[PDB]
């Protein structure tokens, strides 16, 4: 029973019609679809959740199809969101079409028989539809009274100074006409999403019966929380490399608190349930602190990054905490510049006391001379104690950068000229 | 200036901007519209006050645009309106289309120099529009926060089942954009209505300062209300038409007629051309009704159209029928007086039966005895009297009357 299986992983939210729902997953293969709208060049932690959902699914047999808002990106939507966004270009979105859509491809399998993935865009009937279309034939289907008191736009409702445009609030409609259409289309009969979706889903449950007759399905996934009550991914944990490191993503995950890791391997890993209540009952059961944060932290980014971006976090973890930075290449080096450890720019014969200072490793040069006295700053990882000392020509590595380090843990790259 | 004399008719319910439009106005010829949606195959006489207001404006030297909803009629205005109403079908809402086209044309000016009128259908820039375009170009300047503060549709978001669907709550935009549409194509600066399209005209006015960084305005005219606070215009049989195959030049030249005294006035300001001097010296008496009835079935129904009612309601005044035409006693027919269809060779006595003037035939019998029946205007006494050819006028129609006043037309089969 997949529901059940899922349910105890803590990745059912919602779910309509569970009985009838079971008994078609049960019966045989389904078809099943998830939307992720183009609002940047990436997706982020926070949209992992449900693309995992879809594999998961998938493993199961079931067919997933990934569905990218080429036409509801050009529109907003308002779902849980405080305030109006401002509306993106045709040629931006589209940009981040191609981007997202090349992003989920690697997470599905696109030939694995007649359950392969399917990737689909809902430009291609938005693109062409007449506004009389859409106002009769779908809007006659809504009733405005039960929109304006969805949870998900409610609250835009109480200040005319923090609304909602109708663009906005069109969404729903939207959003409900693609389930009809991939139903239509490729037979899909349930559509999951994270739990800010429901609304958006039960409208396509509802649409789809008026207009094909057919019966079909929602599931939610549950919006990650972390136990302590402070916001999840907030350092956004974004999937694309160039936004945020490997080595950011690693450590992102090497720092998951205790009462949060369990659920996290649950949540954004394929290690079996058994395995992980194997772990944590290890974890209870030994005299020392969890191991999970280590697992958790290969197994997603290994998923995410591949092998050679777990490879190049864990080698950029190690010179950190080693000191010895002879084995970072210039590529690891430009991790730790974009986001791996606070960063500063200043010209190449600097001496030891002012890269300090610009770094806000110290507030004045006079207290820069007794910290480098006390033997306390380290360059390259090797212990410097002279005040009056220069940085030598090989401490500057790839001729652009040194890493200052004030006690154990206080870091700042500089990034030469 | 023309907004005071529309305000001393008593035409002149909200006006945006006042002292900025009168400034226009008196400036040179403008440009405006009124609306139309077709959800009937006609106009009625609530169409008729805002169709006069282009007329005023156009004789004062403006250009009205006469728009007729073929893209908003298959939407559905629920302005005021206490339920949401069935979707029309294409190919009904275009029937209905060209009849409220060709029904409108005669109130206008189409060949005047540069003011004459014109005929626009707003299914020509909707009809075609992409939905994304129209969500992201004309949508986004749509608040929903204000959009259900407007009064016209506050009666329909409180309870679902006297709910409002996402269909009719976007008509809002669809009038919007046509007033910045029609600015943009012919320079239209002004949009009348009857008071229930404020919220309408208004969105209209904030969308083209929105879209096109322009200035428009906008004026209503009152509901039609009668002094007793019944409906205006809700007779027996219904709505009082223009057309006249659905109302008789005669039922609605009767229509006028019995206007009472206290809107009588009222309804000379409204829904004629007289002057506002001559309908005040008239008041000073009463003809009033007569003068109201001549100049509102004239403009309607034309010159044959008062000559056939006045004959008829003369016929039927006197009883004598030789005036009556053939096209007379079809207006009779369809609902000028009850009628009855009856097979040739019924008796008089069952012709009273028949047509519910006596209630059987013993009692028709007293009845014609009594010298209350006629026949054409032709008294009858005799109870055994079987009608004579002669008298199927035209070999189709007898006229029955019972006593001074009740009238029935047999029809023969
Ligand atoms: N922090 C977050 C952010 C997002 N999510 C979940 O990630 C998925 C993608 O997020 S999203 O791109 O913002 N999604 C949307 O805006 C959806 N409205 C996209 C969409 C869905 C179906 C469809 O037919 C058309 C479009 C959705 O299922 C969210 O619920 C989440 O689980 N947690
Ligand atoms: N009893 C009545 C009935 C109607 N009217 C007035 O007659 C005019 C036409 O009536 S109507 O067909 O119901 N009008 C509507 O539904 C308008 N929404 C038609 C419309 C206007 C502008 C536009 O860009 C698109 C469409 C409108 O101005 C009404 O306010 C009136 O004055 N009294
Ligand atoms: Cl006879």
Redesign the interface.
Same mark, same amino acid.
Request: glycine share 8%; aromatic share 10%; net charge negative.
């Given at each position: 029973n997949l529901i059940k299986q899922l349910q105890e992983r803590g990745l059912v939210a919602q779910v309509t019609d569970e009985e009838a729902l079971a008994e078609r997953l049960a019966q045989g293969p389904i078809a099943l679809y998830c939307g992720f709208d183009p609002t940047a060049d990436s997706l982020h932690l926070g949209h992992l959740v449900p693309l995992l959902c879809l594999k998961r699914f998938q493993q199961a047999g079931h067919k997933p199809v990934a569905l990218v808002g080429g036409?509801t990106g050009? &529109?907003g939507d308002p779902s849980f969101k405080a305030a109006e966004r401002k509306?993106n270009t045709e040629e931006t979105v589209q940009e981040w079409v191609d981007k997202i859509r090349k992003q989920v491809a690697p997470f599905l399998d696109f030939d694995c028989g007649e359950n392969s993935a399917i990737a689909a865009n809902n430009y291609d009937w /938005? +693109? *062409?539809?007449? !506004?009389?279309? #859409?106002? @009769?034939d779908? +809007?006659?289907? #809504?009733? !405005? *009274?039960?929109? &304006?008191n969805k949870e998900a736009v409610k609250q @835009?409702?109480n @200040?005319?100074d923090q +609304? &909602?445009? #109708?663009?906005e /609030?069109?969404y729903n409609?939207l959003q409900g006409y693609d389930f009809a259409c991939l139903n239509k289309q490729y037979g899909v009969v349930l559509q999951i999403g994270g739990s800010d979706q429901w609304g958006n889903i039960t409208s396509g449950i509802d649409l789809t019966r008026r207009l094909h007759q057919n019966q079909v399905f929602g599931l939610t996934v549950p919006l990650i929380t972390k136990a302590d009550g402070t916001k999840f991914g907030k350092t956004a944990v974004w999937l694309d490399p160039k936004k945020t490191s490997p080595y950011k993503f690693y450590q992102f995950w090497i720092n998951t608190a205790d009462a949060d890791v369990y659920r996290f391997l649950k949540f954004f890993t394929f290690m079996s349930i058994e395995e992980i209540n194997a772990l944590e009952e290890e974890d209870k059961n030994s005299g020392k602190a969890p191991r999970a944060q280590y697992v958790l932290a290969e197994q997603v980014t290994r998923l995410v990054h591949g092998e050679e971006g777990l490879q190049a976090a864990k080698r950029i973890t190690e010179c950190l905490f080693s000191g010895s930075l002879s084995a970072l290449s210039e590529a690891d080096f430009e991790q730790l510049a974009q986001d791996g450890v606070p960063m500063v720019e200043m010209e190449k014969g600097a001496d030891l006391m002012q890269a300090l200072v610009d770094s806000e490793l110290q507030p004045s040069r006079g207290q820069a001379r007794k910290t480098i006295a006390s033997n306390a700053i380290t360059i390259n990882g090797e212990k410097q104690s002279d005040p009056e000392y220069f940085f030598k020509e090989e401490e500057r590595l790839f001729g652009r950068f040194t890493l200052l380090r004030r006690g154990k843990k206080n870091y700042c790259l500089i990034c030469w000229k």
């Amino acid at each position: 029973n997949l529901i059940k299986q899922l349910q105890e992983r803590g990745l059912v939210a919602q779910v309509t019609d569970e009985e009838a729902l079971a008994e078609r997953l049960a019966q045989g293969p389904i078809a099943l679809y998830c939307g992720f709208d183009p609002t940047a060049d990436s997706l982020h932690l926070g949209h992992l959740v449900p693309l995992l959902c879809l594999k998961r699914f998938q493993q199961a047999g079931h067919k997933p199809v990934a569905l990218v808002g080429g036409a509801t990106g050009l &529109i907003g939507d308002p779902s849980f969101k405080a305030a109006e966004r401002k509306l993106n270009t045709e040629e931006t979105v589209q940009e981040w079409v191609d981007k997202i859509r090349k992003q989920v491809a690697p997470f599905l399998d696109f030939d694995c028989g007649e359950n392969s993935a399917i990737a689909a865009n809902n430009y291609d009937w /938005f +693109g *062409n539809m007449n !506004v009389l279309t #859409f106002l @009769r034939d779908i +809007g006659k289907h #809504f009733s !405005v *009274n039960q929109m &304006i008191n969805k949870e998900a736009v409610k609250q @835009r409702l109480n @200040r005319e100074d923090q +609304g &909602i445009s #109708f663009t906005e /609030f069109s969404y729903n409609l939207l959003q409900g006409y693609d389930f009809a259409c991939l139903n239509k289309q490729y037979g899909v009969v349930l559509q999951i999403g994270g739990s800010d979706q429901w609304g958006n889903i039960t409208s396509g449950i509802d649409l789809t019966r008026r207009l094909h007759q057919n019966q079909v399905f929602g599931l939610t996934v549950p919006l990650i929380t972390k136990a302590d009550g402070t916001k999840f991914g907030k350092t956004a944990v974004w999937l694309d490399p160039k936004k945020t490191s490997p080595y950011k993503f690693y450590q992102f995950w090497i720092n998951t608190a205790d009462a949060d890791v369990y659920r996290f391997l649950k949540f954004f890993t394929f290690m079996s349930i058994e395995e992980i209540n194997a772990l944590e009952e290890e974890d209870k059961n030994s005299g020392k602190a969890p191991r999970a944060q280590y697992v958790l932290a290969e197994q997603v980014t290994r998923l995410v990054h591949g092998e050679e971006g777990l490879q190049a976090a864990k080698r950029i973890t190690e010179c950190l905490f080693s000191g010895s930075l002879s084995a970072l290449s210039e590529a690891d080096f430009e991790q730790l510049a974009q986001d791996g450890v606070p960063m500063v720019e200043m010209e190449k014969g600097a001496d030891l006391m002012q890269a300090l200072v610009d770094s806000e490793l110290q507030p004045s040069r006079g207290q820069a001379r007794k910290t480098i006295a006390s033997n306390a700053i380290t360059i390259n990882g090797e212990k410097q104690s002279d005040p009056e000392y220069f940085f030598k020509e090989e401490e500057r590595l790839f001729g652009r950068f040194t890493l200052l380090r004030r006690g154990k843990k206080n870091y700042c790259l500089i990034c030469w000229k």
